[PDB]
Amino acid sequence: LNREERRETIMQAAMRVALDQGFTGMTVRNIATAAGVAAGQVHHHFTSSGELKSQAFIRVIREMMDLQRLSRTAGWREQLFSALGSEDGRLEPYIRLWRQAQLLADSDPEIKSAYLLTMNLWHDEAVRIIRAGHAAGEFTLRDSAENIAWRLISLVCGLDGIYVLGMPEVDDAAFTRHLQHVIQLELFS
Amino acid sequence: NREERRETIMQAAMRVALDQGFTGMTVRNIATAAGVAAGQVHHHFTSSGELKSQAFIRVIREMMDLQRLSRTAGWREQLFSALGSEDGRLEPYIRLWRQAQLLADSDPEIKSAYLLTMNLWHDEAVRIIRAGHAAGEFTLRDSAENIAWRLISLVCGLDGIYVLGMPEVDDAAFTRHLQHVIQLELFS
Numbered sequence: 001l002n003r004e005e006r007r008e009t010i011m012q013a014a015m016r017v018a019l020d021q022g023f024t025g026m027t028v029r030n031i032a033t034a035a036g037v038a039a040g041q042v043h044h045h046f047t048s049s050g051e052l053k054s055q056a057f058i059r060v061i062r063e064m065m066d067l068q069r070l071s072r073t074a075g076w077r078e079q080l081f082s083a084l085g086s087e088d089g090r091l092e093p094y095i096r097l098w099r100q101a102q103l104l105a106d107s108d109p110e111i112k113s114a115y116l117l118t119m120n121l122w123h124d125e126a127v128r129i130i131r132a133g134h135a136a137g138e139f140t141l142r143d144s145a146e147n148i149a150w151r152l153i154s155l156v157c158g159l160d161g162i163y164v165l166g167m168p169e170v171d172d173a174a175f176t177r178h179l180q181h182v183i184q185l186e187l188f189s
Numbered sequence: 190n191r192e193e194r195r196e197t198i199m200q201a202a203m204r205v206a207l208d209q210g211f212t213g214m215t216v217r218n219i220a221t222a223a224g225v226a227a228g229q230v231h232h233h234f235t236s237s238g239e240l241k242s243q244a245f246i247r248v249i250r251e252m253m254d255l256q257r258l259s260r261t262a263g264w265r266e267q268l269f270s271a272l273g274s275e276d277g278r279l280e281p282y283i284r285l286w287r288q289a290q291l292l293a294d295s296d297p298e299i300k301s302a303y304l305l306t307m308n309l310w311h312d313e314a315v316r317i318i319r320a321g322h323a324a325g326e327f328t329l330r331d332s333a334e335n336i337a338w339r340l341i342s343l344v345c346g347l348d349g350i351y352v353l354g355m356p357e358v359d360d361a362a363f364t365r366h367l368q369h370v371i372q373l374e375l376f377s
């Protein structure tokens with residue numbers, strides 16, 4: 001192996017330890033084991049364990065953003081929803097790590113810089129679908145796509161913050177009703 | 190006497206909580222604030238957690254009363270004042286409220302207290318909607334409960350983006366995005 005394909009065989013191993021056990025299990029030794037490489041060789045790439053868990057967390061999200069890009073001929077409403085509040089069981093670890101990363105960003109500026117970058121990735125993706133739907137002629141925009149993109153994200157994050165507490169009146173079904181509701185007020189007035 | 194001093198202790202915990210936060214709510218700094226011995230704190234409080242959790246609820250409870258307007262202002266200005274008021278004097282309440290949901294992942298009592306404040310916050314938003322719906326100023330296309338949660342989620346949400354230092358989400362923009370969802374939720 002030359003130099004850079006190594007970096008990937010390492011990075012991808014970390015991306016599963018994140019999905020499997022979360023940040024608290026993304027120790028240099030766990031990535032070294034999952035990859036089948038010497039533990040000392042891991043320090044050779046992505047110094048500062050903090051980096052191989054923030055730099056890895058991004059790749060997990062980027063993978064999440066791509067595992068949701070679905071049939072383009074589907075209604076721009078169907079696309080936007082799945083890109084904001086998908087209920088696929090396969091994404092539970094992706095969300096779990098995202099929820100997890102949001103807290104750690106308090107006591108880990110390294111994460112914070114990364115969590116900030118995903119919010120921009122999550123935002124730049126919604127803006128695309130908002131603009132695209134607007135250009136196609138299905139979305140009616142009463143405000144800039146950017147403003148709409150931030151407000152919907154805030155709805156998801158905000159509701160997730162309540163859904164995790166255990167509110168019965170805010171569960172899967174209700175988390176969907178609210179979201180689909182707001183989409184109508186923002187794009188189908 | 191019996192409770193007249195229990196309140197001073199609570200008033201001493203509610204005070205340092207806004208000044209120092211949960212990290213600085215030690216028994217030695219709380220007993221100093223009330224001006225009493227430290228031992229008398231455990232006498233009135235079994236666990237140190239029951240003091241941290243209850244005091245936090247008591248801070249927010251009065252916080253919501255402080256920001257209660259005259260009831261004659263427009264129901265929109267009232268609902269707004271209880272959602273996203275941009276006031277410097279709230280920062281200590283907010284900072285404590287942000288910390289409250291963070292520690293909730295590891296402190297079951299702070300989790301219990303935070304869950305209760307969100308319901309109080311929600312119960313108070315329902316009130317303004319129903320009163321503004323009765324006065325005929327609001328137009329409801331959904332129950333006050335659902336609208337309230339969506340409005341609260343919008344605040345908690347942008348707030349999670351605001352603190353990160355996003356330039357396009359500033360003090361002014363936060364106000365704008367909040368005024369917008371009110372317009373759509375209640376004025377169609």
Ligand SMILES: CN(C)c1ccc(C(=C2C=CC(=[N+](C)C)C=C2)c2ccc(N(C)C)cc2)cc1
Nearest residue numbers: 068082083084085086098099102156157160175
């Ligand atoms: C495909 N895609 C782009 C997605 C997919 C899912 C989400 C989030 C989510 C969706 C539905 C949920 N339920 C039905 C229970 C719970 C959480 C979510 C993720 C992170 C988050 N935070 C970090 C606070 C809050 C919510 C976001 C983007």
Ligand SMILES: CN(C)c1ccc(C(=C2C=CC(=[N+](C)C)C=C2)c2ccc(N(C)C)cc2)cc1
Nearest residue numbers: 256271272273274275283286287344345348363
């Ligand atoms: C009077 N009243 C009932 C209030 C008053 C203020 C708030 C919150 C708030 C308002 C405006 C902000 N800016 C203009 C920057 C930032 C935060 C707030 C508080 C806690 C919170 N979380 C715990 C997530 C999120 C937002 C909520 C209720």
